Structure 1
Amino acid sequence: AFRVLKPWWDVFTDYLSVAMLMIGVFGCTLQVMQDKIICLPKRVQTVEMKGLKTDLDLQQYSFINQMCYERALHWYAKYFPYLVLIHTLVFMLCSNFWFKFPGSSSKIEHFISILGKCFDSPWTTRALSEVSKKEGEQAKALFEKVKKFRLHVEEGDILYAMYVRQTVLKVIKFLIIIAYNSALVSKVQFTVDCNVDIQDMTGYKNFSCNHTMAHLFSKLSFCYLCFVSIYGLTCLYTLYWLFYRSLREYSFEYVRQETGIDDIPDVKNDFAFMLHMIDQYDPLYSKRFAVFLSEVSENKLKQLNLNN
């Protein structure tokens, strides 16, 4: 169960990444076959109009097309889809930066197993009814498991640091992408002027060329820019939610407002952050898992087991 730890921003950015992959693949397959330039020499040799004869073979025309595709077309207009592909692959690889390192993955699996096991445990409902046998022994075992989890996760804070590094990397990459794409989006234009020196072959020096797939590349660039802007707004909201509330401290006072138990200790660092994650999924798991943390609940369960 890994999808539970993914909030709305994580799946939103993932689907944005799939959209970016589709855009990059479409741009690449357009650039492989449809991308061509059409060049005509300048200053060439009831009104009856007559066409101008350039006195050029088809091979000379292809040669001019190539010289102007290489030495006149902007590199952005030729390598935009590959840049999109590379950048979105880096985005996809860094999308699960906080999911793939084995220690953090083990912490995720341990926390979700614990939270699901106490979710299935009826002792939570029994204790919530009390405040407001075999399963008792299972609840005691789950409680000592919760204490072991406290001794195993709460003292560390590596998960929060990895998440903040991943978010900062996403934000800085989005800034770079917006910057260079907005700077070079004006270079993708239909009519270009090509001044290569192939006069010794074709006889002309100045050419006017048309990038046939320039309107489509401009629309694709603007769509990719829109997707990048949405991705960056999502990452900026992620950073704002990261920073404006201290996620190294999880407070159970909101549970205390309606639950009488007050011996509940406040967890910190990794526990606090990933309980905030489960709160972002749904606060019910957190306000329900509150009852498994305090020690007077364990003492009450021990007394109940002794009486039974």
Structure 2
Amino acid sequence: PAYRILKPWWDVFTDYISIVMLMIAVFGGTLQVTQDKMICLPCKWVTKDSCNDSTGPTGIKYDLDRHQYNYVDAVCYENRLHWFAKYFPYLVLLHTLIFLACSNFWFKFPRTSSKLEHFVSILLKCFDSPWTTRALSETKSRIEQGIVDRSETGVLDKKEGEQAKALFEKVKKFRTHVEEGDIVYRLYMRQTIIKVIKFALIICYTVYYVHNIKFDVDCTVDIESLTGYRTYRCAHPLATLFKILASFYISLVIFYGLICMYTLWWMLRRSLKKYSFESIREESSYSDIPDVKNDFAFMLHLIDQYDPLYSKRFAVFLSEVSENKLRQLNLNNEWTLDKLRQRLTKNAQDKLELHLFMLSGIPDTVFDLVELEVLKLELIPDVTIPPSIAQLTGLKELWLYHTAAKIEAPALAFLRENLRALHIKFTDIKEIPLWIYSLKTLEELHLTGNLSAENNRYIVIDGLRELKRLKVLRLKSNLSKLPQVVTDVGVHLQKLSINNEGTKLIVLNSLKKMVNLTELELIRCDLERIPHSIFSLHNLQEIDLKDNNLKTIEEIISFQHLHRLTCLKLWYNHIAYIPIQIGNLTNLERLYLNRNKIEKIPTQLFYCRKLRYLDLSHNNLTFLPADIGLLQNLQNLAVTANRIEALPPELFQCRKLRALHLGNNVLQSLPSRVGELTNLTQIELRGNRLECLPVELGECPLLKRSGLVVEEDLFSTLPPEVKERLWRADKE
């Protein structure tokens, strides 16, 4: 059947030689069982019990019937014919049969038979694997920049790809099961040694006893009571033929022994418990081809003896590079374009998003959706951007999450002209691609993860000076000093963000060289104080200093330097008092001072008439100064989680109050002037100590239940018409 490839040439030779040796055994047996006789004549003159060997001549009358001749023939043949001459064919038959049993011990034995049949089936199906020949047909600034050579892609069918995957799985399972065994090799060694020793024994004892087969014999059987003669001389007719057969048999056995000795010598010299495997991969440059252990190097050597090519067709199937390539191809054929379009989402910035989280690799089917805008790749190991990314015309932002991403020359060419934003989240410095600094159109760059280093800190990012068109920068690395590269490159940056998330940062007067800056966010930098140099940024418009453990903000009196300071965020601190000096800040339009310990609202604060957003929640505030009418531009006020229990009338003097957050307070009652808030859209009241809601609330032009945050119990107090109109606005 399929086991023809198991047998080397020396095994086929022994098979045929055993067939011939058994054929001559059968011939000898069938010749002897029928035609083997002895022809005896007695000797009349006997001296010392031997044939004395002592007018035309005449015959010699022995006076014997033919039956007496038959009797003496039988007796003499039974007694004085050498046992080897009488049993040579049976000995030959037995030796041939045991030779054949040795040659087929490891096949009829089901234990190793299972291993051999599994191996031959797997090797056969891998030899005819369609993807194997295709994989074979696949056949210094650039290396250190993170740029790799071109990768060649084709197209594959679904069913044959699944067949290749299943074949890979079967190969993995088989190598797991068989590599440990080292059983078939031991049985093969036992069989070879048994054959060698049996050949030695027979080649000895035969050539010892072959001289016994002689044409003529002398037998002294001592039966005179039946015949009257003592000694007979007899002839063995087949003796010469048996001698010829014995010589031919020992010549065949000598050939068999030579072949077995060659097999033993080869197996001992090779040391084939681990296959070398180096030449094939060294020629093919497939480095994921380890040397296999016992019970699998022996089979490799056998199949190599049958045909070397059969090793190569398996070698590519034992490589991890081939596994990666086939898996990547089945992945490319896996994600349907419809599945991708269903997986397309919309982000907060009205852009199309494809978030690839923990996949095998980048599917090249996603490069067909030309409408993609933002690309997020989370936890894909060491991927490389193919040139096909040039098809994504609408791509603007690239997000990398712990991916040591590489790129190719055409893909880098495209991203040199079509990339605007780059987000990097790296746990290790090596994960940062080094080809990013050649992107001459990159405007927004984000870096997340500890880049902190000793004696080389802020040196790996010195390529930031090359991104001339860089505008945005956000850093989340628990740093303590401003990088020199960022200090130099900030001259053209419009926004710089740092999130030390605990580490105390020192500006070291390195911030005031970035005069073009407009936004500056420093969250959880543990500043404990506003450094002076910030005021030297004359173009700043907003500033957030959240969670810096601030106790005094009296320094904001310097903010008169900024003629375009639009907003100032100081939430999430220990702020207990708002200094009156903020009255100098006439340009303030928004302000945030929540999560603090503020108890009162200073009256001078109401000198900032341009305020439109005020959020001072989570404070000890307990009253509202009457000067709220001064701030006619206010649209959103939050007093959530405060001690507010009264409302001055001037609260309702702001007719453009768009929304309010007045819940989670201790407000006992609401003044009836609520209807004055003609621009009220959303309101919050949950948590207040109210009893009855005002009817004048129900006349608000923009009031809706979704914009009505209040307990349903207190909401029940409203007129039924108010509830009905609220529900109608909910439905409409």
Q: TM-score, normalization: structure 1?
A: 0.95
Code of the aligned partner of 1:115 = L
TM-superposition CA deviations, 1:172-192 (whole Å, max 9, x none): 111111111111100111011
2:126 corresponds to 1:118:
yes
Counterpart-to-counterpart distance in 2, 1:28 and 1:296: 62
Code of the aligned partner of 1:33 = T
Shift in Å at residue 93 of structure 1?
1.9
1:128-167, aligned counterparts within 5 Å? 128-131=136-139, 133-134=157-158, 135-167=160-192
1:14-33, aligned counterparts within 5 Å? 14-33=15-34
TM-superposition CA deviations, 1:55-87 (whole Å, max 9, x none): 222122112212210111101111111111122
What secondary structure is seen at the aligned counterpart in 2 of 1:17? helix
Code of the aligned partner of 1:39 = C
Counterpart-to-counterpart distance in 2, 1:301 and 1:57: 92
2:266 corresponds to 1:241:
yes
In structure 1, the residue matched to 2:36 is: 35
Deviates more, 1:2-11 or 1:149-158: 2-11
Contact 1:44 1:54 in 2 (8 A): no
Code of the aligned partner of 1:266 = D
Shift in Å at residue 103 of structure 1?
2.1
Counterpart-to-counterpart distance in 2, 1:188 and 1:48: 36
Contact 1:44 1:53 in 2 (8 A): no
In structure 2, the residue matched to 1:227 is: 252
TM-superposition CA deviations, 1:203-223 (whole Å, max 9, x none): 221211111110111111111
Q: Higher strand fraction: Structure 1 or Structure 2?
A: 2
2:319 corresponds to 1:294:
yes
Q: Which ranges of structure 1 fall in alignment gaps of 5 or more residues?
A: none
Deviates more, 1:13-22 or 1:264-273: 13-22
Code of the aligned partner of 2:24 = I
Counterpart-to-counterpart distance in 2, 1:21 and 1:119: 37
Counterpart-to-counterpart distance in 1, 2:12 and 2:133: 32
1:138-217, aligned counterparts within 5 Å? 138-217=163-242
What secondary structure is seen at the aligned counterpart in 1 of 2:238? helix
Code of the aligned partner of 1:64 = V
In structure 2, the residue matched to 1:50 is: 58
Contact 1:77 1:214 in 2 (8 A): yes
Counterpart-to-counterpart distance in 1, 2:16 and 2:263: 16
Counterpart-to-counterpart distance in 2, 1:103 and 1:65: 53
Counterpart-to-counterpart distance in 2, 1:179 and 1:301: 60
Counterpart-to-counterpart distance in 2, 1:287 and 1:300: 17
Which stretches of structure 1, 4 residues or longer, exceed 6 Å deviation after superposition?
none
What secondary structure is seen at the aligned counterpart in 2 of 1:195? strand
In structure 1, the residue matched to 2:9 is: 8
Counterpart-to-counterpart distance in 2, 1:50 and 1:290: 88
Counterpart-to-counterpart distance in 1, 2:279 and 2:234: 68
2:283 corresponds to 1:282:
no
Shift in Å at residue 10 of structure 1?
1.7
Counterpart-to-counterpart distance in 2, 1:157 and 1:148: 17
In structure 2, the residue matched to 1:73 is: 81
Counterpart-to-counterpart distance in 2, 1:287 and 1:43: 81
Larger radius of gyration: 2
Counterpart-to-counterpart distance in 1, 2:272 and 2:302: 10
Shift in Å at residue 44 of structure 1?
4.6
2:96 corresponds to 1:96:
no
Shift in Å at residue 199 of structure 1?
2.2
Q: Higher helix fraction: Structure 1 or Structure 2?
A: 1
Q: Which ranges of structure 2 fall in alignment gaps of 5 or more residues?
A: 47-54, 140-151, 334-732
1:218 to 232, 243, 246: 243
Q: TM-score, normalization: structure 2?
A: 0.41
Shift in Å at residue 151 of structure 1?
0.4
What secondary structure is seen at the aligned counterpart in 1 of 2:195? helix
Superposition RMSD on alpha carbons, in Å?
Answer: 1.7
What secondary structure is seen at the aligned counterpart in 2 of 1:193? strand
Aligned residue pairs, count: 307
Shift in Å at residue 201 of structure 1?
2.2
Contact 1:98 1:159 in 2 (8 A): yes
Contact 1:193 1:209 in 2 (8 A): yes
Counterpart-to-counterpart distance in 2, 1:21 and 1:297: 50
Code of the aligned partner of 1:87 = H
Counterpart-to-counterpart distance in 2, 1:56 and 1:307: 102
Shift in Å at residue 300 of structure 1?
2.4
Counterpart-to-counterpart distance in 2, 1:49 and 1:188: 33
What secondary structure is seen at the aligned counterpart in 2 of 1:177? helix
